[PDB]
Structure formats: structure tokens, C-alpha cells
Design an enzyme around this catalytic site. Structure first.
Site, PDB file in Angstrom:
ATOM      1  N   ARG A  10       0.874  -1.168   0.000  1.00 19.31           N
ATOM      2  CA  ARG A  10       0.000   0.000   0.000  1.00 19.31           C
ATOM      3  C   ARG A  10       0.904   1.209   0.000  1.00 19.31           C
ATOM      4  NH1 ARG A  10      -2.504   2.717   4.693  1.00 19.31           N
ATOM      5  NH2 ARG A  10      -4.405   3.780   4.018  1.00 19.31           N
ATOM      6  N   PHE A  64       5.487   1.483   8.167  1.00 19.31           N
ATOM      7  CA  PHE A  64       5.414   2.401   7.046  1.00 19.31           C
ATOM      8  C   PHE A  64       6.552   3.419   7.135  1.00 19.31           C
ATOM      9  CE2 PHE A  64       3.346   6.020   9.358  1.00 19.31           C
ATOM     10  CZ  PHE A  64       2.932   5.362  10.509  1.00 19.31           C
ATOM     11  N   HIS A 102       0.963   5.511  16.752  1.00 21.66           N
ATOM     12  CA  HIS A 102       1.862   4.612  16.034  1.00 21.66           C
ATOM     13  C   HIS A 102       3.255   4.897  16.581  1.00 21.66           C
ATOM     14  CE1 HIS A 102      -1.099   3.273  13.029  1.00 21.66           C
ATOM     15  NE2 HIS A 102      -1.620   4.416  13.410  1.00 21.66           N
ATOM     16  N   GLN A 109       3.724   1.438   2.836  1.00 23.37           N
ATOM     17  CA  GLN A 109       3.470   0.458   3.889  1.00 23.37           C
ATOM     18  C   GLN A 109       3.854  -0.931   3.415  1.00 23.37           C
ATOM     19  OE1 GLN A 109      -0.636   0.334   5.218  1.00 23.37           O
ATOM     20  NE2 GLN A 109      -0.423  -1.391   6.540  1.00 23.37           N
ATOM     21  N   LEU A 152      -0.855  10.922  13.397  1.00 25.13           N
ATOM     22  CA  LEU A 152      -0.564   9.561  13.854  1.00 25.13           C
ATOM     23  C   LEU A 152       0.229   9.571  15.151  1.00 25.13           C
ATOM     24  CD1 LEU A 152       0.399   8.073  10.378  1.00 25.13           C
ATOM     25  CD2 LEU A 152      -1.837   8.031  11.531  1.00 25.13           C
ATOM     26  N   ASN A 171      -0.586  -0.649  12.750  1.00 26.96           N
ATOM     27  CA  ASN A 171      -1.225  -1.482  13.764  1.00 26.96           C
ATOM     28  C   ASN A 171      -2.703  -1.608  13.528  1.00 26.96           C
ATOM     29  OD1 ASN A 171      -0.659   1.296  16.065  1.00 26.96           O
ATOM     30  ND2 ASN A 171      -2.637   0.853  15.147  1.00 26.96           N
ATOM     31  N   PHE A 181       1.960  10.589   1.349  1.00 28.34           N
ATOM     32  CA  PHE A 181       1.662  10.139   2.689  1.00 28.34           C
ATOM     33  C   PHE A 181       2.708   9.102   3.133  1.00 28.34           C
ATOM     34  CE2 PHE A 181      -1.498   7.264   5.120  1.00 28.34           C
ATOM     35  CZ  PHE A 181      -1.043   7.740   6.350  1.00 28.34           C
TER      36      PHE A 181
END
EC number: 5.2.1.8
Lengths: 165, 11
Positions: A55, A113, A126, A63, A122, A102, A60
Site C-alpha cells: 500500500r 510504514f 503509532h 506500507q 498519527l 497497527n 503520505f
């Protein structure tokens, strides 16, 4: 003690792209850094070599780390399937941060990521545990194969990986 | 939205 550096050689549909190396902050998040380091050498008998970045969303992050299901639903840590959020001392301050994906509080497995932008929403959710040391230009090149919804147009794989220091 | 989850990806 020195913080460990590990590398990934990335390939795009089997074509070698280049090497990205990461510094892991074992001095701040020893358990999370160790998990990523051991999955990068494959020393427990499983790890990141041969897995893919499933992904990628341009602007951004990229991942990966799902070495069992290859789709976001699998992977496991070296400690069992999941482990706790170690601490949230470090923040998602800019491009190059390495952080754990997660499924809510205390559900860290193997997925992670690499941020290509500051992602402050985040923070505190994370665990940040490393950063890109060399090869940020390979991460930028990877982003070009992602899309708004995360599907990649080419298969991006970790052709090889290991520890440098 | 822009999250990074493992299993149910949200908007």
C-alpha cells in the site's frame, strides 16, 4: 552501543531499483527496533526478504511488512503475533520516519510504514522507531507507483535486506 | 482518510 542500521534493496517487478538504509532507534525503543532488525536479517527463520510494499499512497507513506498474507492482514513480530506499544516519545515529524502500522492499541506485528511527509495525526497512536539514513531518493521513486487508494501499479518488493551495523 | 492500519483500512 551504536543504533543498528539495516538496509532494504527494493525491486520493481523484479528490476532492482536501489538500496534504502535505516537507522533504528534502539536507544529509545529497544524492543520495537529489535523486532525490525531481526525481521530484516531473517535470523528467526522468517522476515522481510521477498515481501512487498502492499500500500503506497503518494504524499503520505509506503506500507509493507506483511510477509505472511502480503495484503495488510498478516505478519507477526519476533515476540509472538503482536506486542505492546513501547512508548510514543518520537513523532512523525517529516519525510523518512519509520513507524509501526497497527490495528489499534498494543497490536504491533511486523507491518510498518515509511513516511514521505509529516503525518502528525498519527502521533501517539503509532510507535516511531527509525528513520531513512541513505536512499530517500529510492523511497521517492517508490511513491510514483502508488495511488490515492494505495494500490500499486507495479509489484514493489524487498529483494534483499540485512544489517549493515 | 489517511490511516495506516493492518486489516480494516479506514478512509
Amino acid at each position: 552501543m551504536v543504533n543498528p542500521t539495516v538496509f532494504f534493496d527494493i525491486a520493481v517487478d523484479g528490476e532492482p531499483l536501489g538500496r534504502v538504509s535505516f537507522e533504528l532507534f534502539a536507544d529509545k525503543v529497544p524492543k520495537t527496533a529489535e523486532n525490525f532488525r531481526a525481521l530484516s536479517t531473517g535470523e528467526k527463520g522468517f522476515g522481510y526478504k521477498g515481501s512487498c510494499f502492499h500500500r503506497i499512497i503518494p504524499g503520505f507513506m509506503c506500507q509493507g511488512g506483511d510477509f505472511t498474507r502480503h495484503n495488510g492482514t498478516g505478519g507477526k513480530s519476533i515476540y509472538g503475533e503482536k506486542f505492546e506499544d513501547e512508548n510514543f516519545i518520537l513523532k512523525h515529524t517529516g519525510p523518512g520516519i519509520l513507524s509501526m502500522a497497527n490495528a489499534g492499541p498494543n497490536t504491533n506485528g511486523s507491518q510498518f510504514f515509511i513516511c514521505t511527509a509529516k503525518t502528525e495525526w498519527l502521533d501517539g497512536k503509532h510507535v516511531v522507531f527509525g528513520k531513512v539514513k541513505e536512499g530517500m531518493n529510492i523511497v521517492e521513486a517508490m511513491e510514483r507507483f502508488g495511488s490515492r487508494n494505495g494500490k500499486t501499479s507495479k509489484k514493489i518488493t524487498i529483494a534483499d535486506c540485512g544489517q549493515l551495523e | 482518510x489517511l490511516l495506516v492500519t493492518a486489516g480494516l483500512v479506514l478512509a
